[PDB]
Amino acid sequence: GWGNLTCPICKGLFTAINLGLKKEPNVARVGSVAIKLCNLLKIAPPAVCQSIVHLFEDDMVEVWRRSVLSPSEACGLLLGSTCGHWDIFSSWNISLPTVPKPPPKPPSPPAPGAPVSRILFLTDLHWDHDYLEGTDPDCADPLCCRRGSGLPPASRPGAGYWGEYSKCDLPLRTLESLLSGLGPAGPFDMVYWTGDIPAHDVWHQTRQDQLRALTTVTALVRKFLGPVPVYPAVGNHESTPVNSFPPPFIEGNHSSRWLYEAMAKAWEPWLPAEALRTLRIGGFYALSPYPGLRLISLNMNFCSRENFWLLINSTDPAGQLQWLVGELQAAEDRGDKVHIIGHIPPGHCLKSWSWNYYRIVARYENTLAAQFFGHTHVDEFEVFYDEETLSRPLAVAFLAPSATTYIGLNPGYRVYQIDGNYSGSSHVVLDHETYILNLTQANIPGAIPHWQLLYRARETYGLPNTLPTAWHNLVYRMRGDMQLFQTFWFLYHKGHPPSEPCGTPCRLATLCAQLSARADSPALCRHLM
Amino acid sequence: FGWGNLTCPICKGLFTAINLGLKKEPNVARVGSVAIKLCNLLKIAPPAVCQSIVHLFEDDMVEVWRRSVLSPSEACGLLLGSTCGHWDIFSSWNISLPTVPKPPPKPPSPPAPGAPVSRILFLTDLHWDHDYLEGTDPDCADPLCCRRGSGLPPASRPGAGYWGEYSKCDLPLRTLESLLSGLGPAGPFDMVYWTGDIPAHDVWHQTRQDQLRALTTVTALVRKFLGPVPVYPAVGNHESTPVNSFPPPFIEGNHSSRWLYEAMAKAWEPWLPAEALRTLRIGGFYALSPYPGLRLISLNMNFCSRENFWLLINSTDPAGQLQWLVGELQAAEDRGDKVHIIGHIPPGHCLKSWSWNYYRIVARYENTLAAQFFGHTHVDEFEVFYDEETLSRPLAVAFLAPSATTYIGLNPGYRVYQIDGNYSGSSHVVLDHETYILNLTQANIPGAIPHWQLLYRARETYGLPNTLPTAWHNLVYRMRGDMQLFQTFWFLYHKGHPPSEPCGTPCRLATLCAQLSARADSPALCRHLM
Numbered sequence A: 001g002w003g004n005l006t007c008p009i010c011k012g013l014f015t016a017i018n019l020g021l022k023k024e025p026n027v028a029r030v031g032s033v034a035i036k037l038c039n040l041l042k043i044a045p046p047a048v049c050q051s052i053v054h055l056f057e058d059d060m061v062e063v064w065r066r067s068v069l070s071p072s073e074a075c076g077l078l079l080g081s082t083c084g085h086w087d088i089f090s091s092w093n094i095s096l097p098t099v100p101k102p103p104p105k106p107p108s109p110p111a112p113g114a115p116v117s118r119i120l121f122l123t124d125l126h127w128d129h130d131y132l133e134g135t136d137p138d139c140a141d142p143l144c145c146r147r148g149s150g151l152p153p154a155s156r157p158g159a160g161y162w163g164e165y166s167k168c169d170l171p172l173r174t175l176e177s178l179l180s181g182l183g184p185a186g187p188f189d190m191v192y193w194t195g196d197i198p199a200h201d202v203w204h205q206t207r208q209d210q211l212r213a214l215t216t217v218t219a220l221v222r223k224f225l226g227p228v229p230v231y232p233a234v235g236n237h238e239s240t241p242v243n244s245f246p247p248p249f250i251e252g253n254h255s256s257r258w259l260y261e262a263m264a265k266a267w268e269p270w271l272p273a274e275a276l277r278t279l280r281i282g283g284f285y286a287l288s289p290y291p292g293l294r295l296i297s298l299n300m301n302f303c304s305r306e307n308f309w310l311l312i313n314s315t316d317p318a319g320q321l322q323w324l325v326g327e328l329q330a331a332e333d334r335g336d337k338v339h340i341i342g343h344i345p346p347g348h349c350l351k352s353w354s355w356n357y358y359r360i361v362a363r364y365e366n367t368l369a370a371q372f373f374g375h376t377h378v379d380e381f382e383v384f385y386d387e388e389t390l391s392r393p394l395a396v397a398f399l400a401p402s403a404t405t406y407i408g409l410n411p412g413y414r415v416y417q418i419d420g421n422y423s424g425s426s427h428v429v430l431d432h433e434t435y436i437l438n439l440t441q442a443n444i445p446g447a448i449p450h451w452q453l454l455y456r457a458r459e460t461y462g463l464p465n466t467l468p469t470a471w472h473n474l475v476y477r478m479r480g481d482m483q484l485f486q487t488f489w490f491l492y493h494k495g496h497p498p499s500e501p502c503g504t505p506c507r508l509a510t511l512c513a514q515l516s517a518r519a520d521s522p523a524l525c526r527h528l529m
Numbered sequence B: 001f002g003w004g005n006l007t008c009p010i011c012k013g014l015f016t017a018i019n020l021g022l023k024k025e026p027n028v029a030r031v032g033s034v035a036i037k038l039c040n041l042l043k044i045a046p047p048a049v050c051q052s053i054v055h056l057f058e059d060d061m062v063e064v065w066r067r068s069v070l071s072p073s074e075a076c077g078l079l080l081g082s083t084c085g086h087w088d089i090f091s092s093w094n095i096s097l098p099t100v101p102k103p104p105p106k107p108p109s110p111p112a113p114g115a116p117v118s119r120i121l122f123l124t125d126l127h128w129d130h131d132y133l134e135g136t137d138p139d140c141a142d143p144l145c146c147r148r149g150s151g152l153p154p155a156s157r158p159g160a161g162y163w164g165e166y167s168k169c170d171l172p173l174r175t176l177e178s179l180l181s182g183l184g185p186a187g188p189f190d191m192v193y194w195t196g197d198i199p200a201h202d203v204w205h206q207t208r209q210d211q212l213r214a215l216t217t218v219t220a221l222v223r224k225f226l227g228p229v230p231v232y233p234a235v236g237n238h239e240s241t242p243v244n245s246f247p248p249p250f251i252e253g254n255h256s257s258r259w260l261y262e263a264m265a266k267a268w269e270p271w272l273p274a275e276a277l278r279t280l281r282i283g284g285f286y287a288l289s290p291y292p293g294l295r296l297i298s299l300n301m302n303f304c305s306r307e308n309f310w311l312l313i314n315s316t317d318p319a320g321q322l323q324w325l326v327g328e329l330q331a332a333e334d335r336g337d338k339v340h341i342i343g344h345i346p347p348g349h350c351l352k353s354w355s356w357n358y359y360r361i362v363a364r365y366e367n368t369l370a371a372q373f374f375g376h377t378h379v380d381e382f383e384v385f386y387d388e389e390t391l392s393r394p395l396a397v398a399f400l401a402p403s404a405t406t407y408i409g410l411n412p413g414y415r416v417y418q419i420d421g422n423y424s425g426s427s428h429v430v431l432d433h434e435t436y437i438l439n440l441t442q443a444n445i446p447g448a449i450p451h452w453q454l455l456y457r458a459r460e461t462y463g464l465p466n467t468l469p470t471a472w473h474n475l476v477y478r479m480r481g482d483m484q485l486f487q488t489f490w491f492l493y494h495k496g497h498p499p500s501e502p503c504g505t506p507c508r509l510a511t512l513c514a515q516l517s518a519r520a521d522s523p524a525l526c527r528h529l530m
């Protein structure tokens, strides 16, 4: 009978497809057809389509050939079981160590006169380098206010001197202003630097340009902050194409070796030997700023939904989660405490990665003191609960607003007051402050650039402390009180909220976001009606 | 604005490049060879068979996959869906019956005493090997044995019988000569319905020339022995090569089926009138009027078939034939005549939507449709149709006739139906039927003379007041109750040569459930068997 032939004909078919598109000419064909389709969907002008697709085609086809179309996979998709196996984005688990979990003990308020560690948090600087004042703020292009955007017609003004309120990342001068005005204050013990150094022009980006951004902005930070250590993390716009972060099992040229070795060449002064070693492989590391404290810098792109290399293998990329566990357990032993920093927050991640992270923080509550994440470009947080009943806040991650202005925001940075350096310190965020540059004032001719204080957390929300329970109570408190949420919304946008009023469903969506540290998991929002 | 928007265009371009890539013959060769190695890996069957069969399928197979499954997209509509591409493969469809209101139901009236009767001979699944060779190995490693190249049986196993064999072998032409020669007793026939499957079961090395050989020589044989009596054939699943390949009319030659359809109507020109030949050259189905007041429809069930891969491209009412059928059936309702439907594969072995639309049609046209005949099963059984609303009322039954061929351990056999005869007011419904078989245990003895015996008669054997559908329904549930009776139906099921295994309760249930399922993917139909 013929029924037996379907499977072999399928496997052979995708073998011929596989080896067939491994040749460049067909890759060119896919590129051009994709260009015509891009032109059909419009958004954006044709040259952008051309450049972007020419940039993506190679690695895109590479991964699809090695993942989606690899027979099989594909035959396991169309037939399944008997023929092939489709594992794409399959579930996986990281297997915590067998050490029994110590009983949860919440941290105690710091003793009077105890030391305090001030930490500067910079994220999403997004340096354009093509920013040109006077250009068109609203143009047809993924990014405007830069060389090649043209001029605004008639009554619409050009881009501001310090940056603009539409699209338009920052010119280097505004980063210089940010770093010069750091005095008051200040002084900082350390700086957490999340990533996203390059601008949002993703179609024509080049490795040389990305390296330019990384090295020059690193040099700027280093110039202004001097001896204070800066601990960076890898953002989602560092590599090119944007979001392309092949795990360590991909080897050059097309691997990430270039970016990871450009880093750790630039960050050599800040990071110790081991940190650099692990950074050269996967782009993540661990170190000890204080005795009794451990900082973990995670590469969240192996977390990312938009990182297509995960189609190939999405299972604990670079084995980093496991590594993290080894560290966190290493921290439980020794009686130390851990700070985690990263670009993309957990709960923006795929499915399994997020759940494994949640499982880890829940297991490691007493050890993990704080967590910091960027990427959102807006000011918000995320609350973690116990994995069983999800009724008890065990930790919170702080999502800091972007230094960049991207999509209509005032620039800003954050500063954390944290339990300081000494034995027994909890190393937990005591408070935080948010500075912004009001562009309406700063762009006036003759104005004096000023980085104002905006708000202080505890002062604004009346929190007895910054521990998770307080943020939980703040969320449910805002569900009820609309004025309070209006405050949180004003600060959410760094003082430049949009024109749309953000009515009731908007509020509900936002608060639900504040409560979801685990991707999917709709139940986390159950108590919000 | 980010890469996430590009996935769709990159996909569509990807599968365009794949499409044009495997549109070249060298790549087709590569897929063929990989498939050959895989076949050898799964074993079953010997390597030469794998090689030949895949070499026969590869061309058209790649054609269809390129044009359907992999056509971007489709494929992209599968991996992304909705917003990007549309995946319709084996999607639902409906035939839209005409708006004429259904006439009020009513049972056919019993024929008056002394009324005329039309005897019809039903031949199906002749499966002529032409390579059948007595003495060769009946059980060999091969899809088909008892032929040239099967070798000799080792040691104690005897060879193949002169008149055919009881394991995995088709018929030699001489046994078809025997069948057609012994047709006298009895009786005289008014017409002959011939379902299909003329060529043998060797599907790996088949060639168009061979299939046409079978068609023309066997057609010539039937015409020789039955002479002036009309034979209305149908297209079986073994005609075209590769087996089951029946591209709809929207596929054009060379690789289309026009060669087979025009080879027919060249061979069947004496039997079928002009229109029949015209539509048969297109779709392989036709309509004609054997009697005044009666209409015979011959459907090509390959557009029905699950095993026909050309439907991957478009599975929706191939050749628009179902619609055509409606147009004919309605034409009869206004005209007040009755319809006989014949085809190879029975409805309920068909895909999903085709089957359900067929059920809907027969249900709508019940009073008009007098009888239905189908082959393919190679075994003696039937299928009962119910009302589309409550599914409690049998509105019709289709008769699945046993095979003339011996394929898979059966005595050869043919059937003859007694039908309400030619006259005004005739119901044209099956009154009874008979089944003749050639017992090979006796016929293959040296010096024996092949004899085609009577086996059973329906009404007498099952004690049915008539052959109308209600009778067969009552028979099925009676068999659910009575195990001895089912044992009878099982003996006749195999044409008098039931297997060694006792069958029994789960077997019985499966068989009866099959008898009640005329619509594929209709498990509810068997609910009442518990």
Ligand SMILES: *[C@@H]1O[C@H](CO)[C@@H](O[C@@H]2O[C@H](CO)[C@@H](O[C@H]3O[C@H](CO)[C@@H](O)[C@H](O)[C@@H]3O)[C@H](O)[C@H]2NC(C)=O)[C@H](O)[C@H]1NC(C)=O
Residues within 6 Å of the ligand: B056, B059, B206, B207, B208, B209, B241, B254, B255
């Ligand atoms: C239309 O399509 C047909 C199927 O693709 C194709 O039939 C093929 O014809 C060739 C040449 O006659 C045969 O060639 C093979 O077999 C013959 C006879 O055994 C040998 O002489 C050859 O060396 C070779 O082995 C194929 O067997 C035959 N395929 C089948 C299965 O029918 C027609 O030729 C096509 N016609 C046109 C217009 O190209």
Ligand SMILES: *[C@@H]1O[C@H](CO)[C@@H](O[C@@H]2O[C@H](CO)[C@@H](O[C@H]3O[C@H](CO)[C@@H](O)[C@H](O)[C@@H]3O)[C@H](O)[C@H]2NC(C)=O)[C@H](O)[C@H]1NC(C)=O
Residues within 6 Å of the ligand: B439, B440, B441, B442, B495, B496, B497
């Ligand atoms: C096809 O031909 C077969 C051989 O003629 C025949 O099988 C034979 O059937 C008879 C009985 O019909 C068996 O003889 C039996 O007779 C006594 C009578 O008292 C029984 O008690 C015994 O069971 C005894 O078996 C033969 O033994 C048997 N021979 C073989 C080879 O099986 C089939 O019945 C015929 N089948 C059809 C469908 O006609």
Ligand SMILES: *[C@@H]1O[C@H](CO)[C@@H](O)[C@H](O[C@@H]2O[C@H](CO)[C@@H](O)[C@H](O)[C@H]2NC(C)=O)[C@H]1NC(C)=O
Residues within 6 Å of the ligand: A205, A206, A207, A208, A253, A254, A255
């Ligand atoms: C290595 O990395 C990628 C291939 O994955 C490729 O882009 C490099 O070649 C350069 O890439 C530039 C874009 O980033 C492109 O604009 C430039 O023309 C091209 N050529 C060079 C030498 O810069 C690959 N280069 C290597 C090391 O072969």
Ligand SMILES: *[C@@H]1O[C@H](CO)[C@@H](O[C@@H]2O[C@H](CO)[C@@H](O)[C@H](O)[C@H]2NC(C)=O)[C@H](O)[C@H]1NC(C)=O
Residues within 6 Å of the ligand: A289, A290, A291, A421, A422
């Ligand atoms: C954290 O505090 C400890 C003291 O509690 C500091 O360690 C001292 O460092 C000085 C040199 O600057 C040595 O002379 C002392 O002997 C050290 N004492 C101990 C107990 O280690 C440490 O410098 C502080 N860490 C940071 C980063 O400021």
Ligand SMILES: *[C@@H]1O[C@H](CO)[C@@H](O[C@@H]2O[C@H](CO)[C@@H](O)[C@H](O)[C@H]2NC(C)=O)[C@H](O)[C@H]1NC(C)=O
Residues within 6 Å of the ligand: A438, A439, A440, A441, A452, A495
């Ligand atoms: C940023 O600057 C603008 C202008 O200086 C502030 O908006 C002003 O708010 C006052 C409140 O009474 C109004 O009377 C003015 O008309 C506003 N000016 C304009 C042109 O909008 C704005 O509040 C500042 N943002 C913050 C809070 O830092």
Ligand SMILES: *[C@@H]1O[C@H](CO)[C@@H](O[C@@H]2O[C@H](CO)[C@@H](O)[C@H](O)[C@H]2NC(C)=O)[C@H](O)[C@H]1NC(C)=O
Residues within 6 Å of the ligand: B088, B313, B314, B315, B316, B317, B318, B319, B320
């Ligand atoms: C599949 O085939 C049919 C033609 O048989 C295509 O369009 C149908 O054609 C019939 C007859 O002309 C019309 O009466 C129907 O209305 C049509 N149906 C639909 C759903 O459009 C149909 O487009 C083909 N589908 C594919 C996959 O191309």
Ligand SMILES: *[C@@H]1O[C@H](CO)[C@@H](O[C@@H]2O[C@H](CO)[C@@H](O)[C@H](O)[C@H]2NC(C)=O)[C@H](O)[C@H]1NC(C)=O
Residues within 6 Å of the ligand: B290, B291, B292, B422, B423
């Ligand atoms: C069906 O019966 C009809 C009569 O109802 C038969 O037709 C007659 O055939 C004879 C012999 O040729 C003619 O003399 C008559 O003129 C015919 N009458 C009509 C009205 O057709 C016919 O023989 C039967 N048909 C078949 C196929 O048996």
Ligand SMILES: *[C@@H]1O[C@H](CO)[C@@H](O)[C@H](O)[C@H]1NC(C)=O
Residues within 6 Å of the ligand: A001, A003, A004, A082, B044, B045
């Ligand atoms: C087809 O596949 C099944 C296993 O899925 C195998 O057991 C069987 O032998 C194959 N069919 C034939 C006719 O060999």
Ligand SMILES: *[C@@H]1O[C@H](CO)[C@@H](O)[C@H](O)[C@H]1NC(C)=O
Residues within 6 Å of the ligand: A087, A313, A314, A315
């Ligand atoms: C993905 O990585 C994990 C961890 O090594 C391992 O199962 C294997 O390398 C990959 N799984 C696959 C290829 O399915």
Ligand SMILES: *[C@@H]1O[C@H](CO)[C@@H](O)[C@H](O)[C@H]1NC(C)=O
Residues within 6 Å of the ligand: A091, A092, A093, A351, A352, A353, A355
């Ligand atoms: C593994 O993680 C998944 C999420 O990816 C979670 O739903 C599941 O409970 C875990 N599975 C096992 C077998 O522990």
Ligand SMILES: *[C@@H]1O[C@H](CO)[C@@H](O)[C@H](O)[C@H]1NC(C)=O
Residues within 6 Å of the ligand: A043, B001, B005, B083
């Ligand atoms: C593609 O781009 C446009 C404009 O950036 C956006 O509105 C749209 O949502 C994108 N496509 C999808 C499917 O989201």
Ligand SMILES: *[C@@H]1O[C@H](CO)[C@@H](O)[C@H](O)[C@H]1NC(C)=O
Residues within 6 Å of the ligand: B092, B093, B094, B353, B356, B357, B360
């Ligand atoms: C008729 O088509 C509709 C969808 O338009 C579908 O829901 C229904 O099941 C179809 N009817 C049949 C008998 O398939």
Ligand SMILES: [Zn+2]
Residues within 6 Å of the ligand: A124, A126, A196, A375, A377, A402
């Ligand atoms: Zn960013």
Ligand SMILES: [Zn+2]
Residues within 6 Å of the ligand: A124, A195, A196, A235, A236, A237, A343, A375
């Ligand atoms: Zn980012």
Ligand SMILES: [Zn+2]
Residues within 6 Å of the ligand: B125, B127, B197, B376, B377, B378, B403
């Ligand atoms: Zn058959």
Ligand SMILES: [Zn+2]
Residues within 6 Å of the ligand: B125, B197, B236, B237, B238, B344, B375, B376, B377
């Ligand atoms: Zn058949």
